Swiss-Prot record, chain B:
The gene is ubq-2. It comes from the Eukaryota. It comes from Caenorhabditis elegans. This is Large ribosomal subunit protein eL40. Component of the 60S subunit of the ribosome. Part of the 60S ribosomal subunit. It is found in: Cytoplasm.
UniProtKB/Swiss-Prot annotation, chain D:
It comes from Caenorhabditis elegans. The keyword Transferase does not apply. Pfam families: Ribosomal_L18A. One of its GO terms (biological process) is cytoplasmic translation. Belongs to the eukaryotic ribosomal protein eL20 family. This is Large ribosomal subunit protein eL20.
From Swiss-Prot, chain E:
Residues 1-21 are annotated as: Disordered. It comes from the Eukaryota. Disulfide bonds: none annotated. Belongs to the universal ribosomal protein uL3 family. It comes from Caenorhabditis elegans. It is found in: Cytoplasm. The chain holds residues 2 to 101 of 401 of the full protein. The L3 protein is a component of the large subunit of cytoplasmic ribosomes. This is Large ribosomal subunit protein uL3.
UniProtKB/Swiss-Prot annotation, chain F:
Pfam families: Ribosomal_L6. This is Large ribosomal subunit protein uL6. One of its GO terms (molecular function) is rRNA binding. It comes from Caenorhabditis elegans. The keyword Protein transport does not apply. Keywords: Ribonucleoprotein, Ribosomal protein. InterPro entries: Ribosomal_uL6-like, Ribosomal_uL6-like_a/b-dom_sf, Ribosomal_uL6_a/b-dom, Ribosomal_uL6_CS2. Belongs to the universal ribosomal protein uL6 family. One of its GO terms (cellular component) is cytosolic large ribosomal subunit. GO terms for biological process: cytoplasmic translation; determination of adult lifespan.
Length: 132, 51, 201, 179, 100, 188
RNA sequence: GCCUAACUUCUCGCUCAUGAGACCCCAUAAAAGGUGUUGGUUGAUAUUGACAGCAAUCAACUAGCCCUGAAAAUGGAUGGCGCUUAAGCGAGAGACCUAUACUCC
RNA sequence: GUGGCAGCCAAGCGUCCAUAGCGACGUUGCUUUUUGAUCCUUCGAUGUCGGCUCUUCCUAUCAUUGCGAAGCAGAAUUCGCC
């Protein structure tokens, strides 16, 4: 029933707190609530975080218990975890929201016009399909 | 009645333990009463055997 | 922060007191609130606790004249209404005007049978530990005197059948809409470029 | 009464001695490791313990030094054993407890919180006799030992997520299972 | 102080308030449960209390002291001329009760 | 303490299948299928292999961990019920009055008469999927048979508790129908 | 949490009570008990394979919460509603609210 | 305090057997239907005993409903529970 697990080498996504929005790798498990993570190549320092702020990704690295920052960096770069993560809809939505949050007034106007024109055309096509 | 049937009926009617606080009919090999009213008393007595 | 329309809330899988306090705050802040399926609201703790609490509530009646004493409503809607009343200054004009803006129903009346309902995740029953019992206000009302549990069940079954048919139709229309966008791709490519560049898709 | 106020108690090394007199021109120097919120509390607790152990009080003594101690390597996980003595509502008891932490100060803070949680014991009724790092094979508590596994794995079964900066009401469906 | 000697209360408190009936005609507060299998039939009628008299009948009550004996019993006559059916109405269930 | 992980497995013999999902089990064998709902416990039940069903609990407390072997025992009883069924043999004990036992309503109701000489008739309906039989060979023997142990034993206990002595000490007024044996239908 | 201005804010535990508990004076509870659960102390046995049945276990203690001990007369009181990974119990952290008090005008 | 009611340990009674039912020497409580103690309210007045009548309430349950235990083989009787 559960696929992703909290295991050494599991790549986690920081959902809230200090380094929000970044990726790290679980290098140790302290107790049922706390994990030692270290995202050397994603600008996350080796720290201990409460699992309540973390979310499990689909990537698991080939790490060792308490792998040092150098080894974590090597595994991260070898697996290309950042590139593979950037291909998921998880990361695409974050990128889209990042673009959206910084829209200027002119960009908002342009989006309004383009969106309504596209909706009108798609509605014409939908009427065609519905009639048939 | 046949002695085997005697035993069968006594297993259900007589071979049991009685709590000394709530008179609960309890299993023979029990350590505490199961009733909350006595606070699960640990002191029990055998159901009074045919003397 | 006022809402233009009334806030329609589906009461299913909601904790009684939590939802009641949220709704009371909204009513005090000036919104109109409608609660649907009040028979699906949940109370934490085993059924016996709630049943005995309601029995002790029923025991509170004026000795001189019960027609003045506490009025013990059995319908789930009125139970929720009284729970919200408890969290308002209902003896003052402010509290009375706030309470008059609340409508709680069992089932979904025809007026709201075609509107989307809201939920309060901070009042959901899934914030309880999984190994904890809970009671359903519908069952409590039935056991304390409510007489229309079967009627509401039948009406809800019919409503769910009609909704299932409507949802099948809606899925078909949604697939047609996806196909229409795919067909329009060549014409909308000029606008899709801007939409994706600004990050909306 | 003394309280373990503050996230992550600090650790201090306090060195003091009885003020020399004519009959005792040179006096022994005592050193203690104290866990407190700040150095004022550290000094007060040092005098408390030193007066309990030797015939000297703050009036006749002086503090040669007081220095905060910082964890050497906070980037490694260790098992800490804590020997403590505490007062219950009825009698006096000795306890041995174990924690897993990156800092000894963090482990002692965990000990104080745990004692408060499980025994309703306040900081004024707890004495930390000793704190050390124990090896994995030398631990003797199931809760700690269960994490001495290189293949440890587990999911997060029933995740209730709190919406932070958005309206109370939503039409979204809430999901507690994440596979 | 408790009453010295016990005695039941006078009257039935479930028949209060002892007020004049709201209407002159009797209101049927409940009808017999409907069984779909039986033939269609009416469940009530209207009559007038004409008066009382007494009759003699033979009692068939095995085991009774008046078995196969004649007894005198008081009876009431209710004149019930035929009624006329003038309309049809139906009731639909709602969350608040049946509704015409 | 919340133990991180605790599980137990059930291995199915040949000719039996389970197809578990959503904490609902659908065991099926030669004598039909039994469906059981275990949604009152929050454990993960899955198929590990081809004939092994694992029931696992993550971060459970003593009371929750106590239910893993309970669920496993229930599934084992399901297997036994679908393979060899359940048969409870009960014996009538009486001092003077023969306890007359009969079946009515299409063999769906057990009627007990003359218990201790009472003229009342005791009626016990049988649950669906449970049958009763008065042994012609062994006198004073009733047999309750079925796939589901819960329902078979519930019917047997209903019959046993139906014949209870009142206002007379039970230490020697031992009349009644008592479950003498709990066995299987197919000779194991 | 709502009455009620100020978080259903953050961290770790404990507790299920067939009306649990909930904050100085303060608005009662004891001797004595529980194989409910959670921690500890001591003494033993156990891989020269510990107890049960034809891989840890046993025993005695101890103290947190819960339970029994716990009966009164108009209907009734953690202030009320309600609250159960709490809105309870204990240790803590940020912020925030509020006097005719403090600073300034 | 006194009155009333309920517990804890078991020396004994109970043919034998401390606990079926009791329970001494001790000891812990609860109640305000006794009587005391006090003097807080009322002396520009709260009509001061009992009975009669009539409501309602509490149980610390005599009877009745459903049960458990006996030194329960049954009219009968005793103990306890909801």
């Amino acid at each position: 029933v559960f696929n992703r697990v909290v295991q050494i080498g599991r790549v986690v996504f920081i959902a809230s707190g200090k380094d929000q929005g970044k990726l790290a790798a679980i290098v140790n498990v302290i107790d049922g609530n706390r994990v030692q993570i270290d995202g050397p190549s994603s600008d996350v320092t080796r720290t201990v975080r409460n699992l309540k702020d973390l979310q499990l990704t689909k990537f698991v690295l080939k790490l060792r218990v308490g792998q040092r920052t150098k080894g974590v960096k090597a595994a991260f770069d070898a697996a290309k975890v950042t590139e593979n993560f950037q291909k998921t809809q998880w990361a695409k939505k974050i990128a889209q929201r990042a673009i959206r949050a910084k829209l200027t007034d002119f960009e908002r106007y342009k989006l309004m016009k383009a969106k309504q024109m596209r909706n009108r055309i798609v509605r014409v096509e939908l009427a065609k399909l519905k009639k048939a | 009645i046949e002695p085997s049937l005697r035993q069968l009926a006594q297993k259900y009617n007589c071979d049991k333990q009685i709590c000394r606080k709530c008179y609960a009919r309890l299993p023979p090999r029990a350590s505490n009463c199961r009733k909350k009213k006595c606070g699960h008393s640990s002191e029990l007595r055998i159901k009074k055997k045919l003397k | 922060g006022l809402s233009n329309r009334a806030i329609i809330i589906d009461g299913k899988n909601h904790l009684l007191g939590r939802l009641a306090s949220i709704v009371a705050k909204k009513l005090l802040q000036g919104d109109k609130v409608v609660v649907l399926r009040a028979e699906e609201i949940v109370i934490s703790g085993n059924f016996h606790r709630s049943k005995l609490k309601y029995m002790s509530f029923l025991r509170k009646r004026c000795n001189i004249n019960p027609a003045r004493g506490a009025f013990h409503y059995r319908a789930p809607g009125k139970i929720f209404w009284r729970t919200v009343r408890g969290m308002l200054p209902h003896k003052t004009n402010r509290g009375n005007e706030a309470l008059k803006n609340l409508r709680a129903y069992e089932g979904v009346p025809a007026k709201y049978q075609k509107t989307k309902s809201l939920h309060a995740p901070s009042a959901s029953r899934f914030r309880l530990q999984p190994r904890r019992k809970f009671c359903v206000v519908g069952r409590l009302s039935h056991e304390v005197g409510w007489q229309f549990q079967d009627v509401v069940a039948k009406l809800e079954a019919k409503r769910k059948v009609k909704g299932a048919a409507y949802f099948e139709q809606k899925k078909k229309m949604d697939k047609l809409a996806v196909q229409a966008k795919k067909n329009a791709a060549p014409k909308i490519a000029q606008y899709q470029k801007i939409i994706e560049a600004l990050g909306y898709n | 009464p003394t309280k373990a106020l503050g996230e992550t108690l600090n650790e201090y090394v306090v060195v003091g001695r009885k003020i020399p007199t004519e009959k005792e021109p040179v006096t022994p120097i005592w050193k203690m490791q104290i866990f407190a919120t700040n150095h004022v509390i550290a000094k007060s607790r040092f005098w408390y313990f030193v007066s309990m152990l030797r015939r000297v009080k703050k009036a006749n003594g002086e503090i040669l030094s007081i220095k905060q101690v910082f964890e050497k390597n906070p980037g490694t996980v260790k098992n800490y054993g804590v020997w403590l003595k505490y007062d219950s509502r009825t009698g006096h008891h000795n306890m041995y407890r174990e924690y897993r932490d990156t800092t000894v100060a963090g482990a002692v803070t965990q000990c104080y919180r745990d004692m408060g949680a499980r025994h309703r014991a306040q900081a004024d009724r707890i004495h930390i006799l000793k704190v050390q790092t124990v090896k994995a094979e030398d631990t003797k508590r199931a809760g700690i030992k269960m994490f001495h596994d290189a293949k440890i794995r587990f999911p997060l079964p029933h995740r209730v997520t709190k919406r932070k900066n958005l309206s109370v009401f939503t039409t979204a469906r809430q999901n507690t299972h994440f596979a | 102080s408790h009453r010295k000697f016990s005695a039941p209360r006078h009257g039935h408190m479930g028949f209060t308030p002892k007020k004049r009936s709201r209407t002159y005609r009797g209101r049927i507060k409940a009808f017999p449960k409907d069984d779909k299998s039986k033939p269609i039939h009416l469940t009530a009628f209207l009559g007038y209390k004409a008066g009382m008299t007494h009759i003699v009948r033979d009692v068939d009550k095995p085991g009774s002291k008046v078995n196969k004996k004649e007894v005198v019993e008081a009876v009431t006559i209710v004149e019930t001329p035929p009624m006329v059916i003038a309309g049809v109405t139906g009731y639909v269930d709602t969350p608040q009760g049946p509704r015409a | 303490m919340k133990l991180i992980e605790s599980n137990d497995t059930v291995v199915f013999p040949e000719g039996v299948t389970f197809t578990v999902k959503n904490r609902i089990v659908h065991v099926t064998g030669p004598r039909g299928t039994i469906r059981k709902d275990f949604r009152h416990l929050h454990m993960e039940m899955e198929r590990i292999g081809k004939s092994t069903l694992r029931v696992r609990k993550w971060f459970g407390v003593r009371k929750e961990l106590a239910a893993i072997r309970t669920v496993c025992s229930h599934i084992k009883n399901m297997i036994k019920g679908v393979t060899v069924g359940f048969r409870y043999k009960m014996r009538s004990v009486y001092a003077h009055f023969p306890i007359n036992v009969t079946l009515q309503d299409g063999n769906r109701t057990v009627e007990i008469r003359n218990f201790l000489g009472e003229k009342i008739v005791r009626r016990v309906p049988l649950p669906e999927g449970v049958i009763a039989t008065i042994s012609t060979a062994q006198k004073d023997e009733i047999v309750v048979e079925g796939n589901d142990v819960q329902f078979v034993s519930q019917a047997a206990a209903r019959i046993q508790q139906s014949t209870a002595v009142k206002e007379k000490d039970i230490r020697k007024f031992l009349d009644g129908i008592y479950v003498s044996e709990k066995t299987t239908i197919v000779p194991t």
